[PDB]
Amino acid sequence: GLXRKXLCAXAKKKGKCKGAXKLXCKC
């Protein structure tokens, strides 16, 4: 595994993380 784009792919797949994109990967 790996990082912030790992964290963002965490945001996409816990599902319920937030609506606003390039800023969004942070939940």
Q: From CA 12, how far away is CA 25, in angstroms rounded?
A: 8
| Lookup: tokens for 14 | 């816990």
| Lookup: tokens for 5 | 């784009």
- The answer to whether 7 and 16 have CB atoms below 8 angstroms apart is no
CB-count burial class (<10 Å; 0-12, 13-18, 19+) for 17: middle
- The answer to whether 24 and 18 have CB atoms below 8 angstroms apart is yes
